Amino acid sequence: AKRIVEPFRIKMVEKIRVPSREEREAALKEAGYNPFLLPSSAVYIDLLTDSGTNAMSDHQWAAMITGDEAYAGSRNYYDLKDKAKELFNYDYIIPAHQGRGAENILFPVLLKYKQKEGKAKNPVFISNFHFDTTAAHVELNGCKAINIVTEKAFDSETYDDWKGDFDIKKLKENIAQHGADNIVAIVSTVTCNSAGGQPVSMSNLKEVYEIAKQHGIFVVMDSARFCENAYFIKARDPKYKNATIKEVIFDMYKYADALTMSAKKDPLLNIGGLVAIRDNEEIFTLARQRCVPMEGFVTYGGLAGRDMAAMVQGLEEGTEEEYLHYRIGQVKYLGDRLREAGIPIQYPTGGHAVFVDCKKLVPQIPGDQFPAQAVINALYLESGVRAVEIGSFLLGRKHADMEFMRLTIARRVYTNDHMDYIADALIGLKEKFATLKGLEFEYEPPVLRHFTARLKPI
Amino acid sequence: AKRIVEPFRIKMVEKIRVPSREEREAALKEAGYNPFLLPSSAVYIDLLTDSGTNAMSDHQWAAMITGDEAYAGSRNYYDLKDKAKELFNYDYIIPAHQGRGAENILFPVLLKYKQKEGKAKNPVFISNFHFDTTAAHVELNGCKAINIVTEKAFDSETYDDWKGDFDIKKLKENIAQHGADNIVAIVSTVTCNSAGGQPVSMSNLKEVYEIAKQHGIFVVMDSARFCENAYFIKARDPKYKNATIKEVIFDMYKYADALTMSAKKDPLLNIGGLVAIRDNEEIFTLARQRCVPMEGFVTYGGLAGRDMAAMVQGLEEGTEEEYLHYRIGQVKYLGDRLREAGIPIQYPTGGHAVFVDCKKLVPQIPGDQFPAQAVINALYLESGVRAVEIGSFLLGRDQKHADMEFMRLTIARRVYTNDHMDYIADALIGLKEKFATLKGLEFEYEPPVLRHFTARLKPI
Amino acid sequence: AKRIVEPFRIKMVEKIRVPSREEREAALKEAGYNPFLLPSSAVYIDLLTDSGTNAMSDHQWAAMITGDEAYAGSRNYYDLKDKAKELFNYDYIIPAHQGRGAENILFPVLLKYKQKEGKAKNPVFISNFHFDTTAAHVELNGCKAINIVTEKAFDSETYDDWKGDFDIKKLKENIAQHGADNIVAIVSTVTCNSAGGQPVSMSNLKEVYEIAKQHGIFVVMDSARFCENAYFIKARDPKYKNATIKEVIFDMYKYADALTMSAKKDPLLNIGGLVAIRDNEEIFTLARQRCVPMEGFVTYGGLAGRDMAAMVQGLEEGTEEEYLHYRIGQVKYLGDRLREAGIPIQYPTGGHAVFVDCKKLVPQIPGDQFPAQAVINALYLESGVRAVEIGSFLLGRDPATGEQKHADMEFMRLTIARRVYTNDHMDYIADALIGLKEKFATLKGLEFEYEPPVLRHFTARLKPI
Amino acid sequence: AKRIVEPFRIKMVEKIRVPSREEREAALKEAGYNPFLLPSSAVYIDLLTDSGTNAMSDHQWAAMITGDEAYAGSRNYYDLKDKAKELFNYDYIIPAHQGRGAENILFPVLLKYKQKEGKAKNPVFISNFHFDTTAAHVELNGCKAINIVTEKAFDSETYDDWKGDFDIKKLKENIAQHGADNIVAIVSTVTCNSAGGQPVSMSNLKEVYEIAKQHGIFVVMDSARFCENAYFIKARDPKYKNATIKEVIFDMYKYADALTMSAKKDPLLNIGGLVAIRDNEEIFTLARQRCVPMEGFVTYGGLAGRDMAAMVQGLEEGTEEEYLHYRIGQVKYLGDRLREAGIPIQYPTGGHAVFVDCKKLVPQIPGDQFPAQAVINALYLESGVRAVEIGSFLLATGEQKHADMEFMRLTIARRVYTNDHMDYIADALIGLKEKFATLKGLEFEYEPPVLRHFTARLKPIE
Ligand SMILES: CC1=C(O)/C(=C\N=C(/C)C(=O)O)C(COP(=O)(O)O)=CN1
Ligand SMILES: CC1=C(O)/C(=C\N=C(/C)C(=O)O)C(COP(=O)(O)O)=CN1
Ligand SMILES: Cc1ncc(COP(=O)(O)O)c(/C=N/[C@@H](C)C(=O)O)c1O
Ligand SMILES: Cc1ncc(COP(=O)(O)O)c(/C=N/[C@@H](C)C(=O)O)c1O
Ligand SMILES: [K+]
Ligand SMILES: [K+]
Ligand SMILES: [K+]
Ligand SMILES: [K+]
């Protein structure tokens, strides 16, 4: 495992504390053995998500201080519009308060747009993999969310350069079975979050866009971690070996018609989202009409002016290769520490998290008894580290192909010594993994259990 | 006209400038004679809205700096939960990114909850006056938005203590006509924004709630300007003349089962919203299930942790009577300046804006030629001040006739001084003779729905 | 009285409260009837100084956030150097933590410089009027501080354009009587704080510098309020009627060899100072050597990097004419309110404060009983406003006589911070003082309960008679 | 070498970059081969000082935002007064803009106080080791600055618990030789910065104060790094095994009559200083009278209100044992990395820096040719790391004074750099082991008369 030094220094700190073993046992019981219900005061190192927990720079805080809070015509709305033209060559923007607000703006408009002339009678969305909120919006609008990630993403320990790729054969098969008139949109998720923050190749993005364009299908780029995808392209595609990150990004977005973005990831923000449209002015107008009642007026979209200002600066800082190299290298360091100790992970590591394969880490625990959650609760009790489950506990009442515990790493927040604490904590549980029991419900809500369900050890 | 001194001093300033007469001309041209299309750089004093443009305190900024940005279980979420229990006596909260986000969380849930056993086949919402986004969400969910403000709200120059009240007779008539089983909810809007920021009396709130409870109707308090409403109750209701503002708030929320709040108003924030539920845990769980896909996880609701921290502090600052006295007194000062010069306004002034009655101000322009908008564009070109609402332009088409056609001079909180107010009043007064020669306005580009935002007009 | 609207809007507020009459009486008694001992918690509107209480802008705060805190070679030190070259055409800068630290850097160096050839045997400094700290550093270094402001400054109610002018006749007389070899430096104070914030004309600055240069005398511009002085020059000198503020400033500093500046005044800061030297590299080297043990390393001079960053932005904002017009107009507004009500003041009002002439205002209390302090205490008890005394209480006792020094003026200074209070705050101040018009006759004198030997106005405890 | 994990996480970052080899050589030439004259833009990792470069907490920034900027009676002045009473049990405070301003306030006052009744005609100050500005203020006022640190400090590689102690024998000898009536004050520097940030033991502080009280000598604690000194006392003195840091601090300040503090060190600030006096109201009044013309009015002392507010918060954070353990552990980690690789350092590492013994590293350069400065200039050109010299360059009388030690100080700001930054520093210096024998001395081009190392320009001797 190789430690990479920070291309920055610390300007402001925030205290953290390790609760005592008895505090965490009380806290985990009070939360019903669901870390989602733990207060942050009971957590030492928080690896629940990489969303909205990033450390901003002094230039970002400076930009917030001079932010224009105007309800209409904010100086920062035009700066953001100019930034999206520079980065993506897209001509229209609609800010949103975060990524699922951006999805709420655009997806219903795409369905309405497709439903013209009696099309989309059995409408579907096709992605390499829909994120949970993305699939929820697909399903809320009466559509089905189809995921066709490459089969290589389900072979955890088998290296592949592009585990986020579309399965091109499945894409064509789905276009032939459902019909282009039923495909509301293709959603390219970069990186593919649910497959392990795994990158999609430039040539895979290109072939998907070519296929969609010959069938007249609209392509939306889910762009939460697009800078981490661009870095992987430059690292692993020889055609982009000497390209800048911004040149990679500029090429990526030739292969979509629009983007939905959670700026709470790669743009290094604590809040914020964006809709950007390449040139379809009609879809832009319809999305603006939905933005008004759902998010806010069209030049702030549910965001304070200061946060649009922070987004403009963070959009730049997130494309800096020296930072991406350290950021992604830190994820790779925690992953190497675990692999060296025989802990199975999604290999290679993705851009934002280490996905520990708990299906083989605790085989004695069946899927319905939530093996990855049992490992997560044990990691929390032993260490105060909070991780998130991506398996059977997520999206149930059901069986899952993968059972990952996601160690999600906020950007510029934790040091490699924090990584060592995380790795050593999981390594010290190797003898307890065999004797580990499963989990059964105490209270189960009808929907969205993983967020607010209560469990108990069997 | 009496100037009230600030119960604070300035700690941070923000530059503004008057663009030249030439620049203002060119600017309004490129904006198609629509101020909603103007960039902020073309505006001197911005009276478009009082939403999200407020000046925060140093204590609010300090709260943001130590805000907990955690995805789940943020320290500031629990503080906000305690604060809502303190102010409203409500046991459950769901943060939202702003007011219409709160409405998107709660209104679909109330509809689905009302339809649980097969009733509410013709669902409606009843309010003293649904705000634009509020009425939009009820209609996007298939219901009708029924507005029943008191008739006194329609006699502008004639003083009344409570021009935001419900018409209780119309409330009972609509219950009988549609049936209680079709009334998804009653929405008590305080202050009543569309009536001129005019207050609702405590006894009006009390009677509406009791009528609703005997019929089993859920009551929601639209709370964007609840502190300004509480101030007016203390000022005009003898029962509360000697109560604190917090005691008036506490009593107000005995007459609702939940609230939706834009924290961008009376809590003195630039962003933020809130859903609070008194004790109905089933509705709380259903609203939480909708908050997840629409806004965010249930312990931040589409807000940065620092904005929840700012909301906990701002909810306290917004109830302080010394501040409310100055805030509402500054709006009254602007109104008294225009009223003493013979400019008709909604009298008495509300809590957050002066509503200039343009029907009597420019009678030679019909409603379909947008008279209030003509006054606004004339005001802008004269001074650089940007105002909003046209009644007609806002009402749109079905062009439905407008009961009123106000120009709204909306005042952000703790932002402008009374010398800024003198500039606004003197600019409008200086136009008195020009209102006669004032031209109507016609569309050059017209969008269908939501024309007030993006239509490119041109002078007739 | 004409209210001038703010050329800005408010972005952040600080709560203030009026303490109850009971609290104000208790606090003043606890403070020994000396508002300088009051905590800020007992003050509503604080008019003690215009120093370091200013409201900064969002651009100033943004500049602080990205400030470079390096010990040596801070990015903001080089920006400050470029800014002083732009504003003043001065080639060398030494930051200081505030104005009196800038005086502590420069004044002892000038004395040692003048002593190089065995000169300055009876050294003196000559100013239109040394400020208190300026005079203290002169005297601490064994020199005498000579003030020669125009006689017009002492005619309180008689208007004049330039009540801060040097008396040119006295300048030549002092040069002849002391000799150019004994005059360590001429200090041009702009505006002239002690004369009431009154401006110095460009032609008066020019003639002083011309007289000094032929005699080989080094000229220091005391520049705490140079932007307010530049505004008055543009307002009242026809030659500069169409010049920009920066053009006026650029001309002003042709008539000095260096400057000492409190950035806590016109540059709109809460802390900060500056030494800038036109072109004498030798004096720059000596002042750097004194900066190191007194203030800090030469690229921060006792300032956090963020404060140098704020100073670069505030130097720019302080020169903007629309702000200066509002700022100086607010002072004139408070002055006209009092003047229209019969309250005697230093007329015309200066750049930063209104000086109420309590000699004319009150008669039943003599100078040795501190008349201006009795009004200040009355004003505080009535309103929670804290003002500062510029009279017999401040003047002090004569060590030769051991008794009260006779004071030419018994002023109460209503000192106005920049971009902090509105014209409604001014009305509150004026109405408070006007409402005491009948009570002034029955106001009692003040006597010491505790008197320290030196600098008594800061910590002496008084009691009513 | 053991890495200690941060008891915090990062909230805000500041970019740094590595200037190219050509930029550095251009920069160092323009800087006259004195890194003090280098712009920060030419530095990668800045180890020039631990003074005022620290990273504050969100609680400190929040305190600044609500700071009271009043000229008289600021709310934060009374908080600072209460905090000094809580921490040190001292009744009087005068804020200062930084440490040497605190010295400029107090030292001349102490000389004047001592000169009453016509004594102190040959006035001196005695310290375990005066810091540079401290000795400058002693000498500017016409006194002599006598340093009497333990000889243990001069054996770099031999461990000792308390290499910052006073030599008690030399203390008694200097009192007898000069007379107690000529000792203006004894200055106890904690930690002893010039000895290598090495702690003074509690019993050494006690014995020094007891000797001084029996002779009527005033004692000032130079307190820039008093928390790091308290940590070492708790770590190495068995008597304080079960004591809190604040109990150790409270006990330390029983053994002084006043303190002068650079708040730019252990209180974790970017600016700020403090004078605190235990109970001598007369010296308090005289120091206030000097504070007014030198620093500012006595309730802000040359500080913005926001900086006093940050000081009140940082004074608390600087006492937290979990932070001190990490902070001093990071210094020890850099030291152990260099010591494991054969680099001679002052052992054990002190609180705030690693002191590389260059008299052993580069023997072919004599002291008067500044051997530690030659290692520093070579370190910068190689890596962009800026260090500072503590030897002959820092040190009739104009002839080059002999230096007991020739140190390169790798000074570590608080909560700014990670242990991966420390690895970069260590590998960079380790990587110069074969170039050390080839290094050349340095000669003056411009020499100031006082505190020459700050602004002097040098040239290689080659
Ligand atoms: C690919 C993708 C995501 O990963 C995503 C959010 N992911 C979070 C919540 C995570 O923990 O992965 C979202 C939703 O973004 P939001 O959390 O609404 O800003 C959309 N697309
Ligand atoms: C003309 C002049 C001044 O007015 C001045 C400070 N005057 C203040 C404190 C006042 O209250 O008038 C100073 C001292 O600046 P300082 O307060 O040290 O930043 C120097 N020159
Ligand atoms: C009564 C009322 N309810 C809900 C909202 C929507 O809240 P939001 O989403 O903007 O935060 C508003 C907004 N009124 C603003 C827009 C105005 O009067 O201009 C309102 O006045
Ligand atoms: C022991 C000691 N005393 C006094 C001072 C002066 O304090 P200051 O005026 O800088 O705030 C310092 C500063 N030492 C810093 C400069 C260093 O060792 O790099 C110091 O280490
Ligand atoms: K967040
Ligand atoms: K806003
Ligand atoms: K201040
Ligand atoms: K600093």
The sign one gets for the Cα dihedral C241, C244, C249, C254 is negative
Q: Is B131 an active-site residue?
A: yes
As a whole number of angstroms, the distance between CA D45 and CA D35 comes to 13
How many CB atoms lie under 10 A from the CB of residue B245? 21
Q: Which residues of B touch C (CB under 8 A)?
A: 3-17, 45, 55-59, 61, 322, 414-420, 422-423
Give DSSP secondary structure letters for D227-289.
Answer: HHHHHHHHHH-GGGTT--HHHHHHHHGGG-SEEEEETTSTT--SS-EEEEESS-HHHHHHHHH
Q: Tokens 């934002």 map to which residue? A: A352
A303 touches A71 (CB < 8 A): no
Residue nearest to atom 10 of ligand 2 (CA): C49
Q: Tokens 């759902």 map to which residue? A: A294
As a whole number of angstroms, the distance between CA C206 and CA C253 comes to 9
B276 touches B315 (CB < 8 A): no
Kindly name the residue from A222, A257, A266, A357 that is annotated as catalytic: A222
Residues β-bridged to residue C354? C414
Residue (of A262, A181, A251, A259) closest to A225 by Cα position: A262
Residue (of A385, A381, A322, A388) closest to A353 by Cα position: A388
Rg, C-alpha atoms of chain D: 21
Domains and CATH numbers, chain C: 1-57+320-462 (3.90.1150.10), 58-319 (3.40.640.10)
Chain A residues within an 8 Å CB radius of C63: 62
Kindly name the residue from C131, C370, C411, C440 that is annotated as catalytic: C131
The sign one gets for the Cα dihedral A379, A384, A390, A391 is positive
As a whole number of angstroms, the distance between CA B446 and CA B451 comes to 7
How many CB atoms lie under 10 A from the CB of residue A397? 10
Residues 6+ apart with CB under 8 A from A455: A32, A33, A34, A370, A373, A439, A440, A441, A442
The dihedrals phi and psi of C249, each to the nearest 5 degrees, come to -60, -45
Cα separations (Å) of B389 from B355, B367, D38, D333?
9, 13, 60, 67
Chains that touch B (3 or more CB pairs under 8 A): A, C, D
Distance from CA of A419 to the nearest CA of D (A): 9
Q: Which residues of C touch A (CB under 8 A)?
A: 58-59, 61-63, 65-66
Please tell me whether residue A261 adopts helix, strand or coil conformation.
Answer: strand
Please work out whether the CB of residue B133 comes within 6 Å of at least one atom of ligand 3. yes
As a whole number of angstroms, the distance between CA B93 and CA B274 comes to 7
Query: Secondary structure of chain D: what % helix, strand, coil (to 5)?
Result: 45, 15, 40
Both tokens of residue D192? Answer: 């002893």
Q: Which residues of C touch B (CB under 8 A)?
A: 3-17, 45, 55-59, 61, 322, 419-425, 427-428
- Burial status of residue B295 (CB atoms within 10 A of its CB: 0-12, 13-18, 19 or more): buried
Q: Tokens 């000898």 map to which residue? A: D173
Give the total residue count for chain C.
465
Residue nearest to atom 4 of ligand 4 (CA): D99
Q: Give the resolution to one decimal, in Å.
A: 1.8
Pairing of strands C258-262, C219-222: parallel
DSSP C408: S
As a whole number of angstroms, the distance between CA B96 and CA B94 comes to 7
The sign one gets for the Cα dihedral A338, A342, A343, A346 is positive
Please tell me whether residue C359 adopts helix, strand or coil conformation.
Answer: helix
The dihedrals phi and psi of B167, each to the nearest 5 degrees, come to -80, 100
Q: How far is CA B267 from the centre of its chain?
A: 12
As a whole number of angstroms, the distance between CA C272 and CA C77 comes to 13
Distance from CA of C343 to the nearest CA of B (A): 23
Query: Which of D47, D104, D262 most suits a substitution to test ligand 4, by most atoms within 8 Å of the C-beta?
Result: D262
Distance from CA of C425 to the nearest CA of A (A): 27
Task: Read off the amino acid at residue C430.
Answer: A
Rg, C-alpha atoms of chain C: 22
Residue (of D314, D288, D318) closest to D96 by Cα position: D288
Chains that touch D (3 or more CB pairs under 8 A): A, B, C
- Burial status of residue B281 (CB atoms within 10 A of its CB: 0-12, 13-18, 19 or more): exposed
Query: Secondary structure of chain B: what % helix, strand, coil (to 5)?
Result: 45, 15, 40
Chain A residues within an 8 Å CB radius of D57: 12-15
Give DSSP secondary structure letters for C121-178.
Answer: SS-EEEES---HHHHHHHHHTT-EEEE-B-GGGG-TTS--TTTT-B-HHHHHHHHHHH
The sign one gets for the Cα dihedral D220, D225, D230, D235 is negative
Buried b (16+ CB within 10 A) or exposed e, D220-245: bbbbbbbbbbbbbbbebbeebeebeb
Q: Is A71 an active-site residue?
A: yes
Buried b (16+ CB within 10 A) or exposed e, A32-43: bbbbbbbbbebb
Pairing of strands A219-222, A183-189: parallel
Give DSSP secondary structure letters for B183-244.
Answer: EEEEEEESSBGGGTSB---HHHHHHHHHHHHHTT-EEEEE-TTHHHHHHHHHHH-GGGTTS-
Chain C residues within an 8 Å CB radius of B420: 5-6, 9
As a whole number of angstroms, the distance between CA C457 and CA C36 comes to 8
D62/B65 CB distance under 8 A? yes
Residues β-bridged to residue A189? A222
Task: Read off the amino acid at residue D22.
Answer: E
The number of the ligand nearest the C-alpha atom of C64 reads 8
Cα(C388) to centroid(ligand 2), Å: 14
As a whole number of angstroms, the distance between CA A403 and CA A452 comes to 19
Cα(B224) to centroid(ligand 3), Å: 7
Cα separations (Å) of A122 from A138, A283, D2, D8?
12, 21, 62, 52
How many CB atoms lie under 10 A from the CB of residue D118? 7
Distance from CA of C430 to the nearest CA of B (A): 13
Instruction: Give the method used.
Output: X-ray
A304/B140 CB distance under 8 A? no
